[PDB]
Amino acid sequence: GAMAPSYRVKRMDIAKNDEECVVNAANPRGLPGDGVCKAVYKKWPESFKNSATPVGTAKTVMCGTYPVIHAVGPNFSNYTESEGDRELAAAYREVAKEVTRLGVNSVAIPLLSTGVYSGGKDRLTQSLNHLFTAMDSTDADVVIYCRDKEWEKKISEAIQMRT
Template sequence: MTRFEVIEADITTLDVDAIVNAANGQLLPGGGVCGAIHRTAGPELAEACTSLAPCPTGEVRATPGFRLPARFVIHAVGPVWQGGTAGEDRQLAACYRAAIAEAAQLGAASIAFPAISTGIYGYPPEQAARVAVTAVREAAHRHPAVARVVFACFGQDSARLHREALEVLH
């Protein structure tokens, strides 16, 4: 049975097998969580990403973690919010499901997620938390080898929204 946790933390410091990067389609270093992951992992991460790009919205690519505590970085490209009528929920759920499947394929027993698409991509945080938690729970049932899922939230509001979404699904 998969254990789900919500914590306020810098995802780059977590002792998990894999962390998920809220990546852009070209897998380039960016701002927010993506920039922090690239800075901590070192320049080798950007080099590794070059051969894996582009990555379409809703899909993932995996690289080593390099200088991160995590062995792997799973780069997930979330949707840009366009008002909710362009399939954003479906695309966001696909990111989370694909990341769990990739973690299982890599042999990762633990994974940490940021709140994908809620920064510069403008996804409403409350809706994103519900989509994330629902998709991860579904995917974890299909991939029981992923025994621990951490929602690493940047701030109290995001943590509260993820906790509430988990409670609703219990």
């Protein structure tokens, strides 16, 4: 575990993280995809061997000794708000189980279902609150990755509001 488990946020490419493992915002089919998923495919292509897994689950594949946790958030274009919310919570619970099993002291994590799977809605608070629900009982240092300056400020405020 980390000596004093923390949350932090950084505004940069999650493919250049400084943590002991990465969470991919994966598609169910293990395809290279776009956005975070395509950056993760370029950096760790070996981790897409048999990475296909259903919505609401996470599947870890090792790139050398570096774990890639493929977490499949729901596409809100296809899911109802209710079922989508349940699957988004479940994906993060499966991430916490994998981070625990791996025994890592740190993990790089994107906000699931906030990009092309958002169904055109702002889901920063929804996704971050499910991330906290899952990861609060873990002792890894969590580093959240985002690309927007306003999102960075809002995620940082949410972290500091609890401290």
